[PDB]
Design a protein around this ligand. Structure first.
Ligand SMILES: [Zn+2]
Lengths: 49, 104, 50, 11
RNA sequence: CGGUCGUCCGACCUGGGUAUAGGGGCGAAAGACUAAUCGAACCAUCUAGUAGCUGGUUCCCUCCAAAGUUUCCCUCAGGA
RNA sequence: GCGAUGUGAUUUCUGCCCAGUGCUCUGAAUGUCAAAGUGAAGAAAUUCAAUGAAGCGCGGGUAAACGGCGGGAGUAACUAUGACUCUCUUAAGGUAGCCAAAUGCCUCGUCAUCUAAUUAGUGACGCGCAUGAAUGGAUGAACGAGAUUCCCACUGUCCCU
RNA sequence: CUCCGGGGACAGUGCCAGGUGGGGAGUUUGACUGGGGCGGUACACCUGUCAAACGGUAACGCAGGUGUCCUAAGGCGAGCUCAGGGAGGACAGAAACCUCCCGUGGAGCAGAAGGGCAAAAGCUCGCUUGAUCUUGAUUUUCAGUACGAAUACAGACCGUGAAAGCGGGGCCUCACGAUCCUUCUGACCUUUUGGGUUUUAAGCAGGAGGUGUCAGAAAAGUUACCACAGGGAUAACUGGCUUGUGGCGGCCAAGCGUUCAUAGCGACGUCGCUUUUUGAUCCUUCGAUGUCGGCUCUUCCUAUCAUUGUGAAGCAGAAUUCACCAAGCGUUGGAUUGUUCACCCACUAAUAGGGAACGUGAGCUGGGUUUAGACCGUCGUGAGACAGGUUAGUUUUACCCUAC
RNA sequence: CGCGGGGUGGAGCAGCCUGGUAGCUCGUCGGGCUCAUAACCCGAAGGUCGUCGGUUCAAAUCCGGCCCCCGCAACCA
RNA sequence: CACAUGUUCC
RNA sequence: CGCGGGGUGGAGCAGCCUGGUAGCUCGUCGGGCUCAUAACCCGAAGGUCGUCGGUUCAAAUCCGGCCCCCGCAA
């Protein structure tokens, strides 16, 4: 979605290939916006169990 | 400014000067059944969003202080409004100042 | 204003599953008197790739 | 920006 | 169009049939393609849409004859 | 297995920060609340009062989530640099690596080489305006109608037609 | 007696109510401006000046102040004179307190400034709330309309003083706000609808809650994917005016130059030229005059690098400087950079400076600026921005007239 | 703008509640203890209990008025 | 619970 | 030359808007502890707030012209 254009994706656009918004998103978000890490309880590299 | 809690001034019903109990006037609660409020609520009802303008460009930071007079005569009980020039400071009957004492 | 790729997968007609050469639905045997009380013997004819 | 040049067309 | 070029056994090329139709489709992603039309296709209608903005505004003679100044307006290419 | 993401082979790693904005989790311990319903005053409209879910306010987790990761001074026996030390501050004050780079204004930075002569190129130096670790860093065998520097050969590109 | 099981008065549906909701829809993103943006308010007021002796009079003109503050810093009455200076008196001195003299204001009046004020408008006491209620008229900006401010009055009720008198705010020049809506107050007031009573609601009058863009819309950005109507009223380029800046040349001569101001230099002042630099302005052009360089070619200027003819040196010869006539003839090949500019190598008699729409794109090139695709650094939540770098990016037409 | 809850020793909180009670911790000082900074125990000072008025034989406490703060819910001149 | 270290000749 | 900001014991700091009392970390000096240094303990000094002027009853505090330094405008 970063390389996509901003009309067809909420992550597209900008002069640099960056997201510009937190990729973790609530599942209360509507269609067309609920894109990325859906309802992430813990977002990162997993250590341990 | 400082104003006293009593003031002898003209009374409308009596027709002469009588002492009056002095306090500040306060805005009352807006009635839900007023003509403009009922007109506003019927207009605000349904779809269309906000219909009337909402003031946002707050410019001045003071108010015109209004005194609520009170006739001390037991049978008069006349009330009337009195306007004073705008001031940020206001108090009733406080700290009557002297003329040049030793301050610290 | 454009409809994103994630929304376009719900309408189908492009992203539908390719089930032309699939052999069938992989299910278990339906319940009857045999399963409920006793047993029934079945022969493995052949094993095929789906 | 000052311009591009011109791919004119049918007109 | 010519020469010079990349690939040419696999993410290869191609015919026919079929499905996805416009704030929609589809996109190995270029705001690219969608019948020479795409930062929202084409046809008809509302519609003779509005324009403080440009252009134009059709015969003769006689008489009189200017102003670009006050105030106000989200007023400064305009009005009262 | 499906769907939504970020990075982009192999090798080597993936530093610190949850203060901010997000995401996620616990809750009658509850600060708030609309409709509806309950009780009371009133002749009634009406008013008042308690209750009242979610969402927040509160307390944790998360950075291969968005992202960020300092300054002022003195100091070894020639002098300098200066390990070291004092101090102010934040959530951390940039760790391993890399660099005048597609990233550096000053800048045509300094040194060595390439030249007779090089603001070009390569290799080092790093106080880095404003490098830096999956907003991935370093590496780079093979390859690229990708972008630059040099050499042999080759020639009308040119001498000069 | 429900086809078997599994849930079950819970899912789920209908209607309301609250949360969330750029996923989607509509709209907005002020004005002045020596282009625009940025910065400021010159957008509402007041003082001195501009301002040319009635008045009025502009600029993003100069110097400043303001959106207040005062139960007194308001209103009377009474009593004093201030700033400063001199002279004295234990602590006590330059100044702590007392006394005498001079003292037109040089102090103070709430403030910035101007005007004004001495038995006061200043300082200190006494009493009070004229900072109260209600019609009109006039002045100020003016359209001679409002708001605000003020000026003379009238009717009451007062305050103060013995009284004449003064006072309906602040000694004056400034400190503030329309419609609609809301709130409060005033009545033996009007309607609330076929009549009566009572709530309620709507009226009349007087205050308040504000629009500072201040005669008063409810309002965030980006477009390098952009579009339209226009504007040379308005910018980037050439051409015009000016020469601040740059470059160039004289006068005076204090001095350097061993002894000597002018062989050669030359401080401080001063007078000039130039459009090969940059600034300033917007006059021409936005129904388009193709925006940097390099190559090629033609001509012209002298502020003369070389060559020619001449003079002066602190020119023995030689060499090198300076001055005059002088543009006739020449002013190179290369490394780097798109470069203009710049530096270096070598040769040369010298390797001088410039103009012709910063000569020259229907003559050439597209390297760079300056589209649309991308990469990196900084900034922005974001779309995106960067006289910050890198990469690839269509250069059309003469057959018309003139000139040759 | 409304609701809820808070203002207290030099600082923080308790006591407010069902009114007579102003306490504790950190901090200042003194004494004892330690080899000593510290640690440990006691004592002294340290409050109009945010302000004012009313109620009560008695409120910092009950009520109302004023100032400030936090959370949430709002917004036709 | 801290006790770090002090140029050479006999 | 323009706007925003600072200068204070020896190095760094607080205290100003709401002026009535100048505190603290390191450091200097003296003594003690040790044979001596260090560490530690005890005690004392050092702050015209950059300059000038005004203000208020008083100026580090509020205001105006001016010196230095950090980076900014062209
Ligand atoms: Zn009365």
């Amino acid at each position: 979605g970063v390389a996509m254009n901003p009309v067809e994706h909420p992550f597209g656009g900008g002069n640099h290939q960056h997201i510009g918004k937190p990729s973790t998103i609530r599942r209360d978000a509507p269609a067309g916006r609920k894109v990325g890490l859906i309802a992430a309880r813990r977002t990162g590299r997993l250590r341990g169990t | 400014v400082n104003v006293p809690k009593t003031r002898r001034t003209f009374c409308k019903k009596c027709g002469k000067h009588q002492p009056h109990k002095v306090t500040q006037y306060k805005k009352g609660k807006d009635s839900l059944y007023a003509q403009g409020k009922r007109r506003y609520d019927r207009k605000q009802s349904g779809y269309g969003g906000q219909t009337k303008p909402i003031f946002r460009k707050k410019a001045k930071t003071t108010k015109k202080i209004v005194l609520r007079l009170e006739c001390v005569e037991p049978n008069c009980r006349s009330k009337r409004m009195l306007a004073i020039k705008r001031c940020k400071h206001f108090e009733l009957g406080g700290d009557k100042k002297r003329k040049g004492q030793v301050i610290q | 204003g454009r409809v994103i790729r994630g929304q376009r997968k719900g309408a189908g007609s492009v992203f539908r599953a390719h089930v032309k050469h699939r052999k069938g639905a992989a299910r278990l045997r339906a319940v009857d008197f045999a399963e409920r009380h006793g047993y029934i013997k079945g022969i493995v004819k052949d094993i095929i790739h789906d | 920006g000052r311009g591009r040049g011109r791919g004119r067309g049918r007109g």
